[PDB]
Amino acid sequence: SAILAITLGIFATGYGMGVQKAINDRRKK
Numbered sequence: 001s002a003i004l005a006i007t008l009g010i011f012a013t014g015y016g017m018g019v020q021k022a023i024n025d026r027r028k029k
Contacts, residue, residue, distance in 0.1 A: 012020070
């Protein structure tokens with residue numbers, strides 16, 4: 001499932017460094 005890395009990689013940058021981390025600051029996955 002190559003797309004798995006695509007849809008994900010493109011979805012990751014959608015947030016950012018501290019953006020997606022904001023949710024981790026409290027409940028880091």
